[PDB]
Each structure stands twice: as structure tokens, then as C-alpha cells.
Amino acid sequence: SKEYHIDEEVGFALPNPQENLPDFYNDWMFIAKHLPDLIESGQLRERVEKLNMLSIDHLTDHKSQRLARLVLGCITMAYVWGKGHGDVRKVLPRNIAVPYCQLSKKLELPPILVYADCVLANWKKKDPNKPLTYENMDVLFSFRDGDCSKGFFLVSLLVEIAAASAIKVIPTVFKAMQMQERDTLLKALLEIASCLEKALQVFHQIHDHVNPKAFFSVLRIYLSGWKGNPQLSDGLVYEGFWEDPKEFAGGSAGQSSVFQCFDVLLGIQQTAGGGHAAQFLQDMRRYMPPAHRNFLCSLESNPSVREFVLSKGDAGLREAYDACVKALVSLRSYHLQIVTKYILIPASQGGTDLMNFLKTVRSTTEKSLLK
Ligand code: HEM
Ligand SMILES: Oc1ccc(CNc2cc(Br)cc3[nH]ncc23)cc1
């Protein structure tokens, strides 16, 4: 798993993110780094408009394009939504929208902030010798003070990385099916359920680092896009780049490649039927880095793992296979508890279509067991 830009340690996350940009972009890095102060004080829009269009030409390597995609993405969010209480800007100054779309088209990602930006690429190690633990990590950017962007993004990333552990087992699954190595296929499928089970226990920290009021009345604002959004019914103007406004979807863990790849590996068909849930998870593949996108389409090239287990009358496999599927139902069920706390309950102090979506995606996962 190498032309797919999958890291063995952190999987789909970008390993070792650049923290700083070339000096040529210090007028970008200064806004990005002070979005909370700059919003609260009423200047961010100003300070953005008073900017010189910069060239991306001095963004050499990928990690530099990736930091800049993040820097510009966070700034865009800050510009459009501003203070997060309804004063929306619907035109993105050419001095920012042009070099953003330039980089976005270069990296075949939409010009909006995505999961691969504010999670897969929005982190640093405090001490490079300590492991990947919460106490040794931080985020590079945030929107407001108290938006719990650090907790949300790092727990998200830490759960990714947990599930990542399973990705290195996918080759052995497919090889054990080809070579008809029954003992091995079984072990590999239990190893994968075990990784998905640790991913859940990690998710448990969310409560210690996120605040419901903050997630719902603040962070969720800055993460919202402009697709089917009343406040931007027609999209955003990317001044100096598109002639018409363009709708793009806010960030969402449906943009995450790990969970899609296990729904695919296990033959769970979140992307079938043309239902609302399937279409959405399919669309979000277009917000994933291109290599992570071909990773998914390449698994689908493979012999179904599900059909292979069905077809063997081998209780021990049907268990190993169900151990995997169950872990996704565990996670999806624990996710709904958190959605109840961090959205539904604050919302009452809209939120029904979310639950239909999450509950359909679960229902499709549970209805894939063999029990
Ligand atoms: C406060 C914490 C969290 C909240 C409030 C939250 C809320 C939501 C909501 C409302 C959705 C609806 C889909 C969308 O709008 O994009 C969603 C999707 C999703 N969330 Fe979260 N989420 C949180 C943390 C996490 C974490 C830590 C994970 C896993 C690491 C996760 C995994 C997902 C996934 C995979 C989806 C896509 C649907 C699915 O496959 O289950 N979320 N989340
Ligand atoms: O209006 C909104 C906008 C965004 C959201 C949630 N979006 C997310 C962003 C990131 Br990054 C990671 C995530 N995990 N689970 C959800 C999720 C909910 C209501």
C-alpha cells in the first residue's frame, strides 16, 4: 500500500505535517494563525481583503501544498461565516480565491476545507520522540477560542489512526482468499476486528476534550459548507476563478477514507441504491485525496470478502467476519450517542435528517452480519 500514499503508522492521515510555509506566504500564515483574535475583533474580513494575490509557484513539495490548502481553507471558513452568528460573505476575494482554486485543482480537491485538511493534516507532535498520544499532540489551526477544535480534530485523528492499524491487514485478507489459506484469512479478520475495537475505545476521549455547547453553537458553524445551504442558496463566488457561484459540501467524517474502506472490504453497501445515505458517502469520496479515492475503487475491484465467507459454511470464518462487522456497529452506535449529546440535546436548548442518515448507515452495517 504505497502508490496509495498510505502511511504504515498513521494510515490515511498525512504523516509529519509541515507546520510552517515559505516566507513568501507569511501574510497567509499570519491570518490563519490568528483567526480567533482576528474574528473576535472584527478585522478578519478586512485583513483578508487587504491581501496581495500570491503565487502558489513557491509551494514546492506536497506537504507544503497541504499546509497551504489548510491555511487557505481555514481562512475561507473564517471569511464566509465570520463571527458565526449570521453575517455571511458570499464572495471570496480574488486575492485568496484564485490561489486557493489553483492549489485545490492542483491537488484534485474541492476548494473547501475538508477532513483531509482539518484532521488528516492539522496536527503536530509536541516531542517527536514521544508517541502519538493526545498529550503529545496539538492542532495547527482553530477558528475561535473555546471552539474545542483541538479536541474534536485530535480525537478524530486518533480514532483514524487506531483504525489505520487494520489497513495493513487488507492485503493478507485478499491473498489468503486467493491462495485459499483458511487459517490465515481467519486470523487476519480477527486482527482487523481487534483494530476496529480499539478505535472505539479511543473515541471515548471525546468527552474529555469536547464541549457540547461549543461543538454545536460554534465549531459546527465554521465546518459548514455551501451545498443546499439557505445562507448561500447558490454557492460561493470564487472571484477571479469561476464566473458562476459553486456549491461544495462542508467537512464531514463521511469524507474519511478508513471507515469507507471497511464498509467496502466487508461488502457493506453504504453506496448502493441511490438512497440519500449512499449518494452522500459516494459524493464525499470526491473530497478525499485522489490516492485515497483510488484505494477505495481498487478494493471494489477485488473478490468480495463477504461472498467468500458466505460461501464456505465455516462457522469460524462467519464469526471472524462478524467480529469485524460488529465493531463497525459498535462504533456507529457509540457515534449516535455522541451525536445525541453534542447536537440533538444542545439543538433543544434540522437535526432529524442527521439521525436518519446515521441510523441508515448503521442499519445497513448491522444488516450485514451473518447471525
Ligand atoms: C462531537 C463529536 C462528533 C460529532 C458531534 C459527530 C457528529 C457527526 C454527524 C452529525 C455526522 C453526520 C454526517 C455528516 O454530517 O457529515 C457525522 C458523521 C460521521 N461521523 Fe461523526 N461526529 C463526531 C465525532 C466523530 C468521530 C470521533 C468519528 C470517528 C472517528 C466520527 C465518525 C463519523 C463518521 C464515519 C461519519 C460518517 C457516517 C458513518 O459512516 O457512520 N465522528 N458525525
Ligand atoms: O452542520 C454540521 C457541519 C458539520 C458536522 C460534522 N462534521 C464533521 C467534521 C469532521 Br472534520 C469530522 C467529523 N466526524 N463526524 C462528523 C464530522 C455536523 C453538522
Kindly write down the DSSP assignment for every residue of 213-275, as one continuous string. Answer: HHIIIIIHHHT--SSS-GGGTT-BB-TTT-SS-B--PPP-GGG-HHHHHHHHHTT--TT-TT-
Report which bound ligand comes closest to the CA of 261: 1
Q: Tell me the best of 358, 364, 366 to mutate to test the pocket of ligand 1, counting ligand atoms within 8 Å of each CB and taking the most.
A: 358
232, 90 Cβ separation under 8 angstroms: yes
Residues 265 and 334 in one domain: yes
Residues 120 and 263 in one domain: no
- Whose CA is closest to atom 12 on ligand 2? 253
Phi/psi of residue 81, nearest 5 degrees: -85, -25
Residues 256 and 207 in one domain: yes
Going from the Cα of 338 to the center of ligand 1, the distance in angstroms, rounded, reads 9
Q: Provide the residue range defining the domain that includes 63.
A: 18-145+224-248
Can you say how many angstroms the Cα of residue 361 is from the centroid of all Cα atoms in its chain? 17
Which of 213, 248, 283 terminates a domain? The answer is 248
The ligand 1 atom nearest the CA atom of 160: 30
117, 83 Cβ separation under 8 angstroms: no
Residues 292 and 346 in one domain: yes
Return the closest-CA partner of residue 329 out of 204, 196, 206: 196
Return the closest-CA partner of residue 102 out of 58, 145, 159: 58
Residues 199 and 228 in one domain: no
Can you say how many angstroms the Cα of residue 344 is from the centroid of all Cα atoms in its chain? 21
Phi/psi of residue 236, nearest 5 degrees: -115, 145
The DSSP element (H or E) to which 125 belongs, if any, is strand 123-125
What cell does 327 get? Answer: 465493531
58, 25 Cβ separation under 8 angstroms: yes
CA 92/CA 140 separation, integer angstroms: 23
CA 284/CA 249 separation, integer angstroms: 8
Can you say how many angstroms the Cα of residue 90 is from the centroid of all Cα atoms in its chain? 25
96, 52 Cβ separation under 8 angstroms: no
Q: How does DSSP classify residue 14?
A: P
Give the number of other CB atoms < 10 A from CB of residue 269: 14
Phi/psi of residue 213, nearest 5 degrees: -55, -45
Q: Which residues line ligand 1 (CB under 6 A)?
A: 152, 155-156, 159, 203, 206, 210, 215, 252-254, 256, 259, 332, 335, 338-339, 342-343, 354, 357-358, 361
* CA dihedral sign of residues 58, 64, 66, 69: negative
Residues 152 and 270 in one domain: yes
Going from the Cα of 342 to the center of ligand 1, the distance in angstroms, rounded, reads 11
Which of 203, 233, 248 terminates a domain? The answer is 248
Residues 254 and 345 in one domain: yes
Q: How was this structure determined?
A: X-ray
CA 309/CA 319 separation, integer angstroms: 10
CA 105/CA 248 separation, integer angstroms: 14
Return the closest-CA partner of residue 290 out of 116, 93, 91: 116
Residues 49 and 10 in one domain: no
Q: How does DSSP classify residue 139?
A: E
Count of the separate structural domains present in the chain:
2
Which of 215, 248, 281 terminates a domain? The answer is 248
Residues 193 and 254 in one domain: yes
Residues 141 and 45 in one domain: yes
Residues 365 and 264 in one domain: yes
Residues 71 and 1 in one domain: no
* CA dihedral sign of residues 241, 246, 252, 257: negative
CA 141/CA 128 separation, integer angstroms: 19
54, 70 Cβ separation under 8 angstroms: no
- Whose CA is closest to atom 12 on ligand 1? 354
Q: Is 312 helix (H, G, I), strand (E, B) or coil?
A: coil
Phi-psi map region of 42: left, alpha, beta (phi>0 left; psi -120 to 50 alpha): left
